[PDB]
């Protein structure tokens, strides 16, 4: 499972130059960390 | 003297008394927690496992039981024979006269004054001496094992062999089992002989032991009992298992005198000492000591779990309860013979009895007061009993009693004595026809369907408009629907009128307009998946004729269509070798359809760029990358202490889900994207992917110089050294590290990359006159590759002719 | 809470000289250690 500067370094790797999208603390940590995502959630939090 | 089937001494010093008579303990033996001199030569043979844990005083093993020589381990604790854990002011292992363990392993632990452990040749004494576990004791560099004998090879050192200060580790010669000065033993001894190769003369026998001799197989008219003795008929019907409620004496099968029948055997009727063999799922019959289990809560049916067979009467009376049909069917549903009576008093949340499935068989050894076996009364809402045309049963003896069942139509139970067989057995107002079938509608009118229409998560679909038999009758309708794997569904599943165990409900009411005809909308189902639909009416009358009709439509199964497949499930990637990879992965999570292909793709991932500019020589730390006794203390005072009460390549996996890549270059990094298609992929399109990135294995040896190095005199006392660059490296070469020096290579030179692309080389600058020998490594992103072989120059000290 | 060693030494010193009784593996580590269990609980594993 991905967590901390980890996860960002993993973020920033699958989005690459694509980005990050922006626009209830259950978020990634909750998604990503506590409990094991696959790439294809990973990317979801990227832009279009 | 035998002594067991257990001893368990503790707590007390002095009740080590126990062992005073005994030469062979059947069983375990448990010395713990123990806090003077106590000998007992007269223990030799240990059948099952020993174990020792915190005793206090004891220096040697050999203070106590001097002359144990075989410990057969039949039954291991945690698969050890021997567990000798926290002893303290424990020195040695003074077994001495220790010779075989038949089974187990050994687990030392945790003894701080313990030695003679490496003296002890443990190869010689069992077999499995891999599986062994000696940790946390007297490290033997802190503690001094010393012998006052023979000697041979242990691990690969060849050392002495002793087991305490005193006494050496005893051996049999080659030519042979002996006795204690070179004679042979029996072939079926063991151990020690008080003669040489007689039966009646030894300290423990091999495979099995009776009236004094050691045999292979036991006499005919004996069997096994425990792991090495032989017993006759007559001990085996003495014998008594721990004393539960069904307990019973031990059995005979096999030529074996065991505690219970093994799995796939049942006992005998009458001669209860021998197995039958059962060939189906041989029974669980439940016996309780109250005469009439009357289950009135579903916490009450759990004793019943898994029963075949019940030996009494029941008595089910369910006012309340939670989700029952589905519960008393876990329970309840593998009964199959009832050896009295069933009565099913005031349960009103039972609308069918279907949860006493494989019930086949109702006897009459005992029956309520008037000669009946099947006894219902007062069940509000009992719409239908366990008994459609596809259930079967038998009554042996008795009548049925049926009365205030409203809900129940009278022609289910005329039905119901047909399979029973017990058609003219009941009186005239055993079935009534008055208070039973009261508010029950039999004959109902046949709702018929027009027209539906599937998409991928809406069904519409629509009946054909009812007209009531009565002018009267306010007229509504009812949808049931669930999810059916397969059509075998029955229109009752659930309990009382909130068993929400299944079908779904919705009540649509006859349309205004008399042109357009009742429908309904269903929203939120899954793609391709069966559903079970029908609709009732709901038919209001005025006037209360107790002819009741209503109407209900067939079971029809109707099929979402198929949509896009969901992504495969962890996918997981390695590398087994260069220019390979291995990648598996799940079936998707919703299918949508039947399954046809894997569509997985790999790309090639570029070599970071930043990796390429810095150098090196000066930073501390080179980026690699990579390819492709608590548990036993838990389980020891589980068992002690017991309480008082780049392009896209694609490829289709046709059936497996799992593929290998071929032709890969060697050392990179591969983005893994996997697809699943089904059969409607073809117009719909395959679905998303799922990826994963893998990195090959590094080309072994392909990251080290390809040629020799030469070298060409500079300017001051200069070296200008000269290498070919590796062709494909693994991922990319780092840096250089060059290893020079007069008569040892002392000296070294770390060269940058780019300092390599700039001259070809590396100058070692300003040496003192001599000969030299040098050697170059090249580092890649796997790893450093092989030094070059050595190149010899020479430095003048005045470069002239 | 008590575990391995650290519970049988505790073990000792509440039964004392009383010692152990002796006569479904969720047994004391499933009480004692996986959960916090006070020392009335320890006592009742003691001998009469
Ligand atoms: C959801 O999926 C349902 C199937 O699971 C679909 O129901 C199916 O719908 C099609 C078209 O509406 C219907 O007709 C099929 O068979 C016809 C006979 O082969 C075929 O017509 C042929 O002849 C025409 C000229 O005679 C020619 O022009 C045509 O190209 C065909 O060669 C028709 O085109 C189609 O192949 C099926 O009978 C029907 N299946 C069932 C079991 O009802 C439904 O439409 C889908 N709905 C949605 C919203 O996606
Ligand atoms: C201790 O004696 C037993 C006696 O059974 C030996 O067990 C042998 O185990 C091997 C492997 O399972 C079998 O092939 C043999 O047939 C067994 N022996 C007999 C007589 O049946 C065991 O090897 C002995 N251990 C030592 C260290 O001598
Ligand atoms: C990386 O360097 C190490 C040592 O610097 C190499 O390991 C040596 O390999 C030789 C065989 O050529 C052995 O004789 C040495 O005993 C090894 N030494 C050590 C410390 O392991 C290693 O082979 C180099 N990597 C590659 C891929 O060749
Ligand atoms: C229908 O019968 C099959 C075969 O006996 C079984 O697998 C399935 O579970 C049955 N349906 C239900 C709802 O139990
Ligand atoms: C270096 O090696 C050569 C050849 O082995 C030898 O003749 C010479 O004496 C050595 N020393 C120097 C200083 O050249």
């Not at chain 2, 503790?10 to 008394?17: A, I, P, S």
């Not at chain 2, 669930?482 to 009382?496: H, I, L, M, R, S």
């Not at chain 2, 399954?595 to 980026?623: E, T």
């Not at chain 2, 692309?757 to 092989?786: E, H």
Request: proline share 6%.
């Amino acid at each position: 499972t991905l967590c901390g500067a980890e996860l960002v370094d993993a973020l920033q790797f699958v989005c690459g130059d694509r980005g990050f999208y922006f626009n209830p603390q259950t978020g990634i940590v909750d998604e990503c960390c506590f409990r094991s995502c696959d790439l294809r959630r990973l990317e979801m939090y990227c832009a279009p | 003297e035998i002594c067991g089937p257990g001893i368990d001494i503790r707590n007390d010093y002095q009740q080590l008394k126990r062992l005073e008579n005994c030469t062979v303990i059947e069983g375990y033996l448990h010395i713990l927690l123990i806090s003077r001199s106590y000998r007992f030569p007269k223990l030799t043979v240990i059948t099952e496992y020993l174990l020792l844990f915190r005793v206090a005083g004891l220096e040697s093993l050999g203070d106590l039981f001097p002359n144990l020589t075989v410990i057969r381990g039949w039954k291991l604790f945690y698969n050890y024979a021997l567990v000798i854990f926290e002893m303290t002011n424990l020195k040695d292992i003074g077994l001495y006269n220790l010779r075989n363990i038949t089974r187990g392993a050994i687990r030392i632990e945790k003894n701080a004054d313990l030695c003679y452990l490496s003296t002890v040749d443990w190869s010689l004494i069992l077999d499995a001496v891999s599986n062994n576990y000696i940790v946390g004791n007297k490290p033997p560099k802190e503690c001094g094992d010393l012998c006052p004998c023979e000697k041979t090879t242990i691990n690969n050192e060849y050392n002495y062999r002793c087991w305490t200060t005193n006494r050496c580790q005893k051996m049999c010669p080659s030519t042979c089992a002996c006795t204690e000065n070179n004679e042979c033993c029996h072939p079926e001894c063991l151990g020690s002989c008080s003669a040489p190769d007689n039966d009646t003369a030894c300290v423990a026998c091999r495979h099995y032991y009776y009236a004094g001799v050691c045999v292979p197989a036991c006499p005919p008219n004996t069997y096994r009992f425990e792991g090495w003795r032989c017993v006759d008929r007559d001990f085996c019907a003495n014998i008594l298992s721990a004393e539960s409620s069904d307990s019973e004496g031990f059995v005979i099968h096999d030529g074996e005198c065991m505690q219970e029948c093994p799995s796939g055997f049942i006992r005998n009727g009458s001669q209860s000492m021998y197995c039958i063999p059962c060939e189906g799922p041989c029974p669980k019959v439940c016996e309780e000591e109250k005469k009439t289990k009357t289950i009135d809560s579903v916490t009450s049916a759990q004793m019943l779990q898994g029963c075949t067979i019940f030996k009494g009467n029941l008595l089910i009376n369910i006012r309340r309860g939670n989700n029952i049909a589905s519960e008393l069917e876990n329970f309840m549903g593998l009964i199959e013979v009832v050896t009295g009576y069933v009565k099913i008093r005031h349960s009103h949340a039972l609308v069918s009895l279907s949860f006493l499935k494989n019930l086949r068989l109702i006897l009459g050894e005992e029956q309520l007061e008037g000669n009946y076996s099947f006894y219902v009364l007062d069940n509000q809402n009992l719409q239908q009993l366990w008994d459609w045309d596809h259930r079967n049963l038998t009554i042996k003896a008795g009548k049925m009693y049926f009365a205030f069942n409203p809900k129940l139509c009278v022609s289910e139970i005329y039905r119901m004595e047909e399979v029973t067989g017990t058609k003219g057995r009941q009186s005239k107002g055993d079935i009534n026809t008055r208070n039973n079938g009261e508010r029950a509608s039999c004959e109902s009118d046949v709702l018929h369907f027009t027209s539906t229409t599937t998409s991928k998560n809406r069904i519409i679909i629509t009946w054909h408009r009812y007209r009531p038999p009565d002018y009267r009758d306010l007229i509504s309708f009812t949808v049931y629907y669930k999810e059916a794997p397969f059509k075998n569904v029955t229109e009752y599943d659930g309990q009382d009128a909130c068993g929400s165990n299944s079908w779904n409900m919705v009540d649509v009411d006859l349309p205004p307009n008399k042109d357009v005809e009742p429908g309904i909308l269903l929203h939120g189902l899954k793609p391709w998946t069966q559903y079970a639909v029908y609709v009732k009416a709901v038919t209001l009358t005025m006037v209360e004729n107790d002819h009741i009709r209503g109407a209900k439509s067939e079971i029809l199964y109707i099929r979402t269509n198929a949509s896009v497949p969901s992504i495969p499930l962890d996918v997981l990637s390695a590398s087994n070798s260069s220019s390979q990879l291995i990648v598996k992965w799940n079936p998707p999570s919703l299918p949508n359809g039947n399954l046809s292909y894997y569509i997985v793709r790999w790309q090639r991932q570029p070599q970071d760029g930043y990796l390429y500019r810095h150098n090196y020589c000066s930073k501390d730390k080179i980026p690699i990358r990579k390819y492709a006794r608590k548990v036993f203390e838990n389980f020891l005072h589980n068992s002690i202490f017991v309480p008082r009460p780049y392009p896209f390549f694609e490829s289709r996996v046709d059936n497996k889900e799992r593929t290998v890549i071929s032709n890969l270059r060697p050392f990179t990094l591969y983005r893994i994207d996997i697809h699943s298609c089904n059969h409607e992929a073809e117009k719909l399109g395959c679905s998303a992917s799922n990826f994963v990135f893998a990195r090959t294995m590094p080309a072994e040896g392909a990251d080290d110089i390809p040629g020799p190095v030469t070298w060409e005199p500079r300017p001051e006392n200069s070296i200008f050294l000269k290498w070919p660059e590796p062709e494909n490296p693994n991922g990319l070469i780092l840096m250089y590290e060059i290893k020079y020096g007069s008569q040892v290579e002392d000296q070294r030179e770390c060269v940058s990359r780019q300092e390599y692309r700039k001259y070809g080389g590396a100058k070692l600058n300003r040496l003192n006159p001599g000969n030299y020998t040098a050697r170059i490594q090249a580092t890649s992103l796997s790893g450093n590759g092989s030094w070059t072989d050595p190149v010899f120059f020479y430095v003048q000290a005045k470069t002239g002719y």
